[PDB]
Design a protein around this ligand. Structure first.
Ligand code: PJO
Ligand code: PJO
Lengths: 115, 115
């Protein structure tokens, strides 16, 4: 699992469950091409998005649909989505965990990158 | 000043000075059109982006060039940029501060919306 995404809820102190997200990869013409998508599980984690063969060098974007998550909880959030953009595998393959911690008007994102 | 941006540095404990950013407004065809841009001041703030007349309801994206900021300090960053995508809503007189707190492998953003 070279790319995993973990989402937490800072209001409830819990994993953020059923959070949809889309992953895009920048193509040679500099447009965003669909790469993978999914939703977080009961643990707030989304596994199995890609494989080591498919996950080549490039610039990737993870668009986390935080708006839908908050609205289903009756909260009108500030952000449309949390957007994480990064170069992957520039120095050879890595494993990437993209984490997001969500509040209605704020979010943080970090990456844990291992060899 | 209906819209202001402030950027802090979590490694140095200081405003993030000379950080470039562009603001985009979502167009009818889902494209991002340039709206405003600038560089943060010695206080890490960017003022005068727009006016109340021009800053109408809609979806806006602030794209913060965090990669160049870290490169200039000699620090290897994870993100290509920090993106903040939000809907501007007319519900009372509102002034928006978009803030970002930067680390090489992590960032946080929040909105301080006041009257
Ligand atoms: C931005 C997301 C985030 O905010 C934080 C605030 C305080 C401490 C950690 C975090 C954190 C994490 O990244 C994170 C949390 C867990 I639990 C975890 O298992 C993994 I891997 C990553
Ligand atoms: C993500 C932005 C952010 O990260 C933080 C981490 C800890 C405490 C506060 C913050 C903070 C702020 O909102 C913020 C900070 C300052 I100083 C400020 O002048 C204004 I307006 C806003």
């Amino acid at each position: 699992c070279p790319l995993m995404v973990k989402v937490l809820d800072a209001v409830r102190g819990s994993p953020a469950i059923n959070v949809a997200m889309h992953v895009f990869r920048k193509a040679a013409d500099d447009t965003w091409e669909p790469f993978a998508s999914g939703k977080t599980s009961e643990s707030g984690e989304l596994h199995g998005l890609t494989t080591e063969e498919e996950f080549v060098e490039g610039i990737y974007k993870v668009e986390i649909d935080t708006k839908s998550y908050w609205k289903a909880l009756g909260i009108s959030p500030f952000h449309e989505h949390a957007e994480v953009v990064f170069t992957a595998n520039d120095s050879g393959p890595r494993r990437y965990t993209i984490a997001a911690l969500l509040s209605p008007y704020s979010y943080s994102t970090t990456a844990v990158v291992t060899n």
